Amino acid sequence: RLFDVKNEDGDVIGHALAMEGKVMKPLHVKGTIDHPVLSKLKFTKSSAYDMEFAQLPVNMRSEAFTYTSEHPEGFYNWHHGAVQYSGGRFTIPRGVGGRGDSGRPIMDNSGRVVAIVLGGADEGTRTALSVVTWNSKGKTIKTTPEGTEEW
Secondary structure, three states: OEEEEEEOOOEEEEEEEEEOOEEEEEOOOOOEEOOOOHHHOOOEEEOOOOEEEEEOOOOOOOOOEOEOOOOOOOEEEEOOEEEEEEOOEEEEEOOOOOOOOOOOEEEOOOOOEEEEEEEEEEEOOEEEEEEEEEOOOOOOEEEEOOOOEEO
């Protein structure tokens, strides 16, 4: 599920995630996804969304995250604490995101993913994130951004 993408030393610039049959990965994260098989797949770009993706190895699937378009107002969860659903805007405090986080999912409590981060724009006291999400009438993927700094 959880996978890292490194640079030169081998530095984590971002993250790749195995979900709903595929491997998602934010394009701008120029690097190699660290996995002797994943790093060998044919990935396709969607630039209108900043995603890159390969079809899951026909067994890896099994351990894939699940997605969900149900996104109430509330708190969600991410590797560095709580995520607020501040009326259509996913937020995080100010001072918490940056290099390393592009790629990381945001889940609910049920353990399903709600969105994958790409960057953030600090509005005041919080950072509203650049989020690619999907809603209900198919996977209708969605890049939501503020006057953002991709990270």
